[PDB]
């Protein structure tokens, strides 16, 4: 998310076991890196290998 240029990073690591779909359970997240940049972000792109 982005609140007036204050960008935050939320992450979570947990093992699952499925094939195609996502698990329909409940899991919280943990903030890792705070980046107070102060810019406006309108687009994004997912990096693949």
């Amino acid at each position: 998310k982005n609140i007036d240029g204050y960008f935050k990073i939320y992450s979570k690591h947990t093992p699952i076991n499925l094939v195609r779909d996502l698990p329909q359970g409940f899991s919280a997240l943990e903030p890792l890196v705070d980046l107070p940049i102060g810019i406006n972000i309108t687009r994004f792109q997912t990096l693949l290998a």
Partner: protein, 49 residues
């Protein structure tokens, strides 16, 4: 003719005058933008009671 190299070289000799002595000048620039304050320095902490 009328074509001189603009990047002239300095002169640093210990036997010359004071004007040819090298000085390391550091210029610190400070500006304000919409980004929040990230620099610290007055953050002084004391012993806990």
């Amino acid at each position: 003719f009328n074509c001189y190299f603009p990047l002239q070289s300095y002169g640093f000799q210990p036997t010359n005058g004071v004007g040819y002595q090298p000085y390391r000048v550091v210029v610190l620039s400070f500006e304000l933008l919409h980004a929040p304050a990230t620099v610290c320095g007055p953050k002084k902490s004391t012993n806990l009671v």
